[PDB]
Design a binder for this molecule. Structure first.
Ligand code: MG
Ligand code: MG
Ligand code: MG
Ligand code: MG
Ligand code: MG
Ligand code: MG
Ligand code: MG
Ligand code: MG
Ligand code: MG
Ligand code: MG
Ligand code: MG
Ligand code: MG
Ligand code: MG
Ligand code: MG
Ligand code: MG
Ligand code: MG
Ligand code: MG
Ligand code: MG
Ligand code: MG
Ligand code: MG
Ligand code: MG
Ligand code: MG
Ligand code: ZN
Lengths: 151, 82, 224, 211, 99, 127, 100, 114
RNA sequence: CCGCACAAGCGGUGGAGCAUGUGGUUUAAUUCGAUGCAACGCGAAGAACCUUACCUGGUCUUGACAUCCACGGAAGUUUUCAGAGAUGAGAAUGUGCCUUCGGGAACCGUGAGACAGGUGCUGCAUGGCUGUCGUCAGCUCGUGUUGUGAAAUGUUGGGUUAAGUCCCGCAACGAGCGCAACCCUUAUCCUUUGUUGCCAGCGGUCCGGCCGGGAACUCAAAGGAGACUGCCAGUGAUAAACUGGAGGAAGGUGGGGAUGACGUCAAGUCAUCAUGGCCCUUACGACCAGGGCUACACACGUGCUACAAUGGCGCAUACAAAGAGAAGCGACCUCGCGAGAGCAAGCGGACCUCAUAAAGUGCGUCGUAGUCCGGAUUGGAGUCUGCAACUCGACUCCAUGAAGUCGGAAUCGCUAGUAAUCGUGGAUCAGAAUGCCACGGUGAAUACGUUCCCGG
């Protein structure tokens, strides 16, 4: 991409919910192109998110997303000539994408005897601002704010 | 492993030699290049040298050795470690 | 052309007194408003005597090359050449247009081959993109050597507008001995023009006057 | 920087094959084996008849081979008696009733085989290679070609080192598939060794596929 | 009651020329020809090394595309099969006449 | 009158019967639903008909072998759109801006020499 | 390669050829059930006595033109090498470089 | 439970619980079960002696536990003392079925050496 | 100014087990070449014998292979003994054909030398072929002009492009080899075409396009159309171009191939072949048997399968493409737990067969464990192929169930149908694929950028 600015291709929305942000979410959960088993997990997670974690699942999904999506970032470059921990701000699409990444692997680190169980449990605990990826979100606002002395 | 329908494999010159040996009483340990043939109840109490690539090696064939082939007793490689 | 005929067109006009060439002093009437004024008393007889030579050359079957690369006056010079069945250069002069005649002949041959090929056929045999590319090359060659495709050989006379702008052409001509007829503004060096016309070379009206008078006398020389 | 066989790629496009019979796999290998052997036999025999092209086509009940050369009468000898004996020796070496026929060449200096072999022959004559290939390209382009390239490689003039050289003239468009590029190779066995010679002749463009 | 003529060849050029010839020949005997039926041509691919020694990665891929056609006549009359035996074709073509 | 679906896709195979006056879908003589085990397929196929809101105005009968599930679904979708245009001639713009007459040619890649997979290079070791 | 090898192969072919019938029938006897269980035995004995180089498996495809075992192409019966030049010159009918 | 074996089956599906018996794989397991004609999902629990006896008797039909180890031990033993080649490789503790001693024979070879 | 060069990402490698290559060491020999990028699943598209060149031993000397001269014999077949076989030793049987009667053909043997023979040496003597820089955009010439000349110009500058691509500026103008494009394939529509392919509308059906019947559709493969920055708007010297839009199956060289300038590295190959020159010739040549290439303290590279509930297992149940086949593919039926066997259909193949795709889907199961994960290793017993499976094959079955619980530093690959995963086929081949070469299924993430990294 030295000549053209390329990012993500134009995603098509998840039909049964009509939206595409969930389509991007399942493209995050995908493993080896196995869409089917992935989207099964997202559904089996949002369901019990709705029940044991307050209703409006498609909506609580993003309210937790906000509770986990960070705002400050760090792209440490040789802008001053060497490695310096520089705080920066990144556009929102990269932000929500990385938020998805943070929550997904956090899910992969709970076990809970079931994958959708892990996903739902951690996503709810995020909607409560008491969870796993939110720990490192506060920690990313600790790290992006810890060496702001020289950019 | 050899199929049961075909049965045990032995080369005919070994057959000649062993039957001559048995009818002729104890004889000189016969020499052979055939690691292929299997051991038979005939070759018992006999001894026989099989041509390992370097040199023929004698083996006093006994009963429990029957079935196995000759070559399983003539190690065709030498080694002692490093 | 009569002095009154020139003066109304503005032939007396010239470049700024800041920008003049030393040899042009004899041809300069004076200065007004920091502007060089050309003297028509010299301009008219020299132009007439040049028209005499041009009529002579054209009356011995001469080939005439009208030369001018001004973006304003290109079409004027082209039409001027067409009005007397002659050859022209109206686009940027290419070095070796006369001295490198052999290369121009090879380029002429390619232009002739392309136009003949389109009439003959085989464009359908070519891929549509390839046929379009051949048409684009034919158009580009027609834009470039439109005037000299039919010159056949080196011309017998040259008519040049703004001789300073076209200095490569006159250097070539002198190297070949081909005579130079040129409208020479005060900023030009008149050494290269054997029949020198000192006059404005930018103004469309005076340029068209020069071209029309020359072409009338050239047709006259042809008619006999 | 190795090129690709300029003959091979233009097969079907502008270059027809040198063997046009058809067969299945069962009789395939031996088929080309036979016609190879007849090619080799022939090329040993008619070495003096300036032979350029030799095509084997086999109808179901017979085989027929065709010869493009510049020395017709040589091949024909008298009454084709040498031709007839060739017909015999090929019919038996192919084990099939053969019928050979010749189709001479008009511009012997304009096909790659004849010029390459003339070059390599003069090289065996120990004439100077340089002037040789120059005469080659001169005659070619003079005759009406549009491009000629010659290349000679290995131990030039007996030099104790391999001084490979080449010469080009006219126009030889090697990347333009539709281009008629005749191309061939030959070899000289000097006292000092073996020297390769490659030849390209470009007779211009053809438009409309193989037809 | 039928005569099926199945042809194989190496180039669609010759195969189609032959089909044209044979069907017009059927029109000479007033036959009942089936206009030539192209069938799947087969592609024999071949990948082969080029460097004599060391370079396995360098390779080349050639291919044989055998073209195929089917023609048929639905009324076997002698007046057809005679000409069907009067056929001359290029060596590139293989014929299969079958009643 | 007669309006057909007949979809191939990346060498898929499927045939379909669209007809006005009622709405239903039956696949392979099996009911649509039990066949496309992944719902997203039934979605992607119903999407064009639902977009025009003619779902209950004309019914379809498909039968599909050749290609994979998603490919077949895409093929029959494109065929539905072909047919809708075939039918009213009015839905051109609506459908194209929906992106259905795209007829994508995204295919697999001819596996290339010296590559583990087409566009995949063996793990050369610098060290 | 060494013409000893080429001749060795041609002799191997000649051997495995003439003995084909005997090989086949003894194969039948050994394979088929219902043998006298010594008819099978004496049959496998008489078999192994036949010329060892009469088994066709002993043969090894060899480039007919250059006598090399590796690179054999059953369809043309040539090495991977000789087939190439044989193609580029245009001998193998209908052959050409693929591109797809 | 004891089940006429030194080892005790774990509380799992009967097929898994009986595979715990040495010399008894899955095929052997379900062979025992269907031979006793007992279902597959029962634990060692919820299965009284009235069935444990049946199991013990049906498994005693096959050599298992200590008797099997002795048998394979004697096979290998007489292999070694036969002086047979594979017996040799068993004595020297290297692969006996024609593997690579060049590399990655560590399964039998064991750990690594410089 | 460029590049999956970095960044942005996804997936690895580096740990384990195993497969494979290499070096080391051992050995009787462990054949030979390949050695940074650009050698190390490389020559080899396939070492049980064979192959095979290497060792041990058994042998042969115009010779295994070729031409010549002779001299004799039909050619052969079948058969005995010795031998491990090479080989010898035979005995019978046949003892023929064109012949104008001599012979010739025919082979076969003996002799005779001329001679064969060499994977013996030199890729720093060579041809050929190939890698590499690099599909990089360059490399040059004619002519012209300039200069006394060596030369320069063109080819630089301003833009712009994937591009020395284009445009203007420009004493250069033109060209050539490149680039591009003509070629293949792919994406849309038109031609006949209906067979063995198709089945819309018709009639029947046993419900099977199966069968009348259809020629529409899918196809099949021939021929064609089609995209051109063409259209609109913007931007820009109005230049080139670029941005956007329209339309359109397709938009900006649509996708992918093939296509490798001048040259660079005495790059690689004398063991494909060819070949200068040297070297062997009762032997460095020739034949046979057995052995080795498969060797264990090791090390390195390449891979495979894993470590698990996105999972395993059962049950059902789906869901492709591209191929191959007649000393072949081999149906159905029976038999066998199976690897298989018997029988034998059909098919040189749009017909028959390989050959029922796997992931998927539905249900149940397992509850996080070295486990129902993993499958190494061994034990036992088989199967097929092949003279022959000891060294040293593939496969089944039973039993056994290692290490392994995501792997240091480091490092690799990838910009879309890609990655990642899933199977399928093929070449080679009696048999012997985790390699190679193809085929489809499913199918992502991310790319602010050029600061740097490396390379150009
Ligand atoms: Mg190449
Ligand atoms: Mg040789
Ligand atoms: Mg073999
Ligand atoms: Mg088991
Ligand atoms: Mg990165
Ligand atoms: Mg490893
Ligand atoms: Mg080596
Ligand atoms: Mg060597
Ligand atoms: Mg590789
Ligand atoms: Mg041997
Ligand atoms: Mg070299
Ligand atoms: Mg520039
Ligand atoms: Mg310029
Ligand atoms: Mg190109
Ligand atoms: Mg285009
Ligand atoms: Mg557009
Ligand atoms: Mg070197
Ligand atoms: Mg070397
Ligand atoms: Mg090896
Ligand atoms: Mg086929
Ligand atoms: Mg297991
Ligand atoms: Mg794939
Ligand atoms: Zn002026």
């Amino acid at each position: 991409p030295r000549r053209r600015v390329i990012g993500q291709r134009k995603i098509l929305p998840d039909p049964k919910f009509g939206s595409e942000l969930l389509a991007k979410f399942v493209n995050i959960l995908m493993v080896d192109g196995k869409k089917s088993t992935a989207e099964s997990i997202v559904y089996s997670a949002l369901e019990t998110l709705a029940q044991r974690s307050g209703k409006s699942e498609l909506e609580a999904f993003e309210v937790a997303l906000e509770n986990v999506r960070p705002t400050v970032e760090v792209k440490s470059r040789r802008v001053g000539g060497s490695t310096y921990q520089v705080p920066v701000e990144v556009r929102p699409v990269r932000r929500n994408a990385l938020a998805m990444r943070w929550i997904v692997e956090a899910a992969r680190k709970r076990g809970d005897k079931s994958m959708a169980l892990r996903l739902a449990n951690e996503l709810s605990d995020a909607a409560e601002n008491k969870g796993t990826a939110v720990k490192k979100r506060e920690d990313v606002h600790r790290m992006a704010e810890a060496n702001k002395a020289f950019a | 492993p050899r199929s049961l329908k075909k049965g045990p494999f032995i080369d005919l010159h070994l057959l000649k030699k062993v039957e001559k040996a048995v009818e002729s009483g104890d004889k000189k340990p016969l020499r052979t290049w055939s690691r292929r043939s299997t051991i038979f109840p005939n070759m018992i109490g006999l001894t026989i040298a099989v041509h390992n690539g370097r040199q023929h090696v004698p083996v006093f064939v006994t009963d429990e050795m029957v079935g196995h082939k000759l070559g399983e007793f003539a190690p065709t490689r030498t080694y002692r470690g490093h | 052309v009569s002095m009154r005929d020139m003066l109304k067109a503005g032939v007396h006009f010239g470049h700024q007194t800041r920008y003049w060439n030393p040899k042009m002093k004899p041809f300069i009437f004076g200065a007004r408003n920091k502007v060089h004024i050309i003297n028509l008393e010299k301009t008219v007889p020299m132009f007439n005597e040049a028209l005499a030579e041009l009529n002579k050359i054209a009356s011995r079957k001469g080939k005439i090359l009208f030369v001018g690369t001004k973006r304003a006056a290109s079409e004027a010079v082209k039409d001027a050449a067409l009005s007397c069945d002659q050859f022209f250069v109206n686009h940027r002069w290419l070095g070796g247009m006369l001295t490198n005649w052999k290369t121009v002949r090879q380029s002429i041959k390619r232009l002739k081959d392309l136009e003949t090929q389109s009439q003959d056929g085989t464009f359908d045999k070519l891929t549509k993109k390839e046929a379009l590319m051949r048409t684009r090359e034919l158009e580009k060659l027609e834009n470039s050597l439109g005037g000299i495709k039919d010159m056949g050989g080196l011309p017998d006379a040259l008519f040049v507008i703004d001789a300073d702008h076209e200095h490569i052409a006159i250097k070539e001509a002198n190297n070949l001995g081909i005579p130079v007829f040129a409208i020479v503004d005060t900023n030009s060096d008149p050494d290269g023009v054997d029949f020198v016309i000192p006059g404005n070379d930018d103004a469309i009206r005076a340029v068209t006057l020069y071209l029309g008078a020359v072409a009338a006398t050239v047709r006259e020389g042809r008619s006999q | 920087g190795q090129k690709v066989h300029p003959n091979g790629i233009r097969l079907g496009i502008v270059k027809p094959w040198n063997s046009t019979w058809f067969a299945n796999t069962k009789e395939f290998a031996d088929n080309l084996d036979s016609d190879f052997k007849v090619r080799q036999y022939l090329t040993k025999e008619l070495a003096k008849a300036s032979v350029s092209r030799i095509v084997i086509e086999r109808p179901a009940k017979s085989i027929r081979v065709t010869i493009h050369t510049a020395r017709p009468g040589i091949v024909i000898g008298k009454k084709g008696e040498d031709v007839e004996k060739l017909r015999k020796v090929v019919a038996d070496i192919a084990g099939v009733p053969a019928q050979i026929n010749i189709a001479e060449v008009r511009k012997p200096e304009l096909d790659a085989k004849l010029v390459a072999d003339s070059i390599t022959s003069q090289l065996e004559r120990r004439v100077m290679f340089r002037r040789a290939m120059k005469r080659a390209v001169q005659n070619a382009m003079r005759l009406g070609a549009k491009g000629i390239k010659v290349e000679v490689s290995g131990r030039l003039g007996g030099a104790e080192i391999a001084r490979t050289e080449w010469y080009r003239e006219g126009r030889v468009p090697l990347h333009t598939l539709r281009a008629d590029i005749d191309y061939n190779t030959s070899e000289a066995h000097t006292t000092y060794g073996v020297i390769g010679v490659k030849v390209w002749i470009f007779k211009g463009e053809i438009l409309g596929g193989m037809a | 009651q039928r005569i099926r003529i199945r042809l194989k060849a190496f180039d669609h050029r010759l195969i189609d020329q032959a089909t044209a010839e044979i069907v017009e020949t059927a029109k000479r005997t007033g036959a009942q020809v089936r206009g030539p039926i192209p069938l799947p041509t087969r592609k024999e691919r071949f990948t082969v090394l080029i460097s004599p020694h060391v370079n396995k990665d360098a390779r080349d891929q050639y291919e044989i595309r055998t073209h195929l056609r089917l023609v048929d006549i639905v009324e076997p009359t002698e007046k057809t099969v005679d000409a069907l035996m009067r056929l001359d074709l290029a060596a590139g073509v293989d014929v299969q006449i079958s009643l | 009158n007669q309006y057909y679906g007949t979809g191939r896709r990346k060498s898929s195979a499927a045939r379909v019967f669209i007809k006005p006056g009622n709405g239903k879908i039956v696949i392979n003589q099996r009911s649509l639903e039990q066949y496309f085990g992944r719902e997203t397929a039934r979605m992607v196929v119903r999407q064009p008909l639902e977009l025009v809101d003619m779902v209950e105005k004309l019914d379809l009968y498909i039968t599909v072998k050749g290609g994979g599930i998603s490919g077949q679904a895409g093929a029959i979708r494109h065929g539905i759109t072909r047919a809708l245009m075939e039918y009213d001639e009015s839905l051109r713009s609506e459908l194209r801006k929906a992106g259905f007459v795209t007829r994508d040619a995204r295919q697999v890649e001819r596996k290339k020499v010296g590559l583990r997979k087409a566009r995949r290079r063996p793990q050369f070791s610098k060290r | 390669a060494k013409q000893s090898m080429k001749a060795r192969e041609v002799k191997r072919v000649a051997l495995a050829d003439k003995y084909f019938a005997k090989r086949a029938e003894l194969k039948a006897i050994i394979s088929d059930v219902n043998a006298s269980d010594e008819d099978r035995w004496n049959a496998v004995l008489k078999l192994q006595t036949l010329p060892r180089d009469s088994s066709p498996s002993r043969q090894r495809n060899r480039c007919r033109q250059t006598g090399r075992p590796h690179g054999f192409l059953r369809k043309f019966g040539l090495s991977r090498i000789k087939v190439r030049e044989a193609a580029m010159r245009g001998e193998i009918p209908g052959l050409k470089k693929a591109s797809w | 439970a004891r089940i006429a074996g030194i080892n005790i089956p774990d509380h799992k599906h009967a097929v898994i619980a009986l595979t715990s018996i040495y010399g008894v794989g899955k095929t052997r397991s379900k062979a025992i079960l269907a031979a006793a004609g007992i279902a597959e999902d029962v634990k060692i629990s919820e299965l009284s002696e009235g069935q444990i006896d049946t199991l013990r008797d049906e498994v005693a039909k096959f050599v298992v536990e200590g008797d099997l180890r002795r048998e394979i031990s004697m096979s290998i033993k007489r292999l070694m003392d036969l002086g047979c080649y594979r017996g040799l490789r068993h004595r020297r503790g290297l692969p006996v079925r024609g593997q690579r001693t060049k590399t990655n024979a560590r399964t039998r070879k064991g750990p690594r050496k410089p």
